[PDB]
Design a protein around this ligand. Structure first.
Ligand code: HEM
Length: 397
């Protein structure tokens, strides 16, 4: 008997840690240690999907004496209206009600067109430069921050102001840096709300200001704006990097995609399914039990912490035959869990798919000789950030 301890080592830069796959083979749920409190780790697709849809499992901590969290995790939980278990039901419901209609079909159609032109322009600059080039800086970073500038109705140069703020806010290693960066986000967003009240446009904060019919406070609106800024670009950047790395590892599929850009939607779903980096701590969705829940023969008791391993579940052979293989020819693959599922299903997921599809429609057709300019093992997944990610991706072409 040796209690497994998260986070598990991964000898590769991508994929699932061997110990987590080992637990997955043994069964759906295991008690594990963590850096903080012990938790139930759930690793099989069926049980992770079921529990994500179970209303007894929530983000908020119901415990009287809550275990201390990093400033970074506290900020993330508060941006998600999970900081107070007694008000989470009403506050979370309001959050989703106010954010979901900010991603209308009308907006997403307009944004898809702008996104596609912008990727064309980004790749033209890339193709004209002299390798080695940092694909992370000049492509992966630039498209999702472009998109957030569009959503917020701010000049594109603003992303040079806010482009490191999700990383700094979600830096679990430095509480002081996390809090100081979050204060910058807050100040910026409160300035933006004040401007949009006299100079509105076709953008998210202007719509929230107009909502029913001006009843939201500036602080309420800025809180929603902060969630869009802090969840709305960094994770997408990470998936562009991961998708590039995965396609570089699979030259037959990459050549298929270069020949037929109509495979890009399929490629994007495989990228989301398989795109897990380093120790994959961001692919563990945290929850607390607000009532007793039975999983197989294991009883999760009220108050227990649960880690839902969406990454491991997306690799589950029970759900995806040859679960570790990248295959954009999969016929009717199950819906992956990389955007979550249930009450907190990612609000931006349709927009994120539009971004990834536009990139991977184009990338290897425009740059067919694209390849890493450094060994894979030199790429450093940033474990201390809640969102993970690589800091650079050197390429030649
Ligand atoms: C490939 C890109 C993305 C991935 C993989 C991703 C992933 C996720 C996941 C897994 C969750 C659920 C967390 C949980 O259940 O505790 C989530 C929540 C959320 N995401 Fe995304 N996300 C992406 C892009 C975006 C974008 C572009 C936006 C908006 C512009 C966005 C906005 C949100 C919001 C507001 C939430 C909170 C939902 C809630 O708590 O009800 N995300 N995201």
């Amino acid at each position: 008997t040796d209690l497994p301890r998260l986070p598990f080592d991964n000898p590769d830069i991508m994929g699932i840690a061997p110990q987590m796959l080992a637990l997955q083979k043994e069964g759906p749920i295991a008690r594990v240690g963590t850096a903080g409190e012990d938790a139930w780790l759930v690793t099989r697709y069926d049980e992770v999907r079921t529990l994500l849809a179970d209303r007894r499992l929530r983000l908020s901590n119901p415990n009287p004496q809550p275990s201390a969290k990093s400033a970074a995790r506290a900020f993330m939980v508060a941006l998600m209206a999970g900081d107070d278990h007694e008000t989470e039901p009403a506050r979370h419901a309001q959050m989703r009600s106010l954010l979901i209609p900010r991603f209308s079909t009308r907006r997403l159609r307009l944004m898809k067109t702008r996104i596609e032109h912008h990727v064309d322009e980004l790749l033209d600059q890339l193709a004209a430069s002299a390798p080695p080039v940092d694909l992370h800086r000049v492509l992966s970073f630039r498209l999702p921050t472009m998109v957030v500038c569009d959503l917020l109705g701010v000049p594109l140069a603003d992303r040079e102001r806010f482009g490191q703020w999700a990383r700094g806010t979600f830096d679990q290693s430095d509480n002081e840096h996390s809090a100081n960066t979050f204060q910058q986000v807050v100040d910026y967003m409160l300035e933006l709300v004040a401007r949009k009240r006299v100079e509105p446009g076709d953008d998210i904060l202007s719509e929230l200001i107009a909502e029913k019919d001006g009843a939201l406070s500036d602080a309420d609106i800025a809180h929603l704006g902060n969630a869009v800024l802090l969840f709305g670009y960094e994770t997408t950047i990470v998936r562009i990097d991961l998708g590039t790395l995965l396609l570089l590892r699979n030259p037959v599929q990459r050549a298929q995609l270069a020949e037929d850009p109509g495979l890009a939607p399929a490629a994007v779903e495989e990228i989301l399914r398989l795109g897990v980096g380093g120790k994959g701590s961001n692919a563990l969705i945290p929850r607390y039990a607000h009532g007793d829940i039975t999983v197989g023969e294991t009883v999760i008791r009220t108050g227990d912490a649960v880690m839902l391993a969406i990454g491991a579940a997306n690799y589950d052979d029970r759900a995806f035959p040859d679960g570790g293989l990248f295959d954009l020819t999969r016929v009717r693959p199950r819906s992956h869990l990389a955007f979550g599922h249930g009450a907190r299903h990612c609000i931006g997921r349709t927009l994120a798919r539009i971004e990834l599809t536009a990139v991977f429609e184009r990338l290897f057709r425009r740059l067919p000789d694209l390849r890493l300019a450094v060994p894979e093992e030199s790429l450093r997944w940033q474990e201390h950030r809640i969102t993970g990610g690589f800091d650079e991706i050197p390429v030649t072409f």
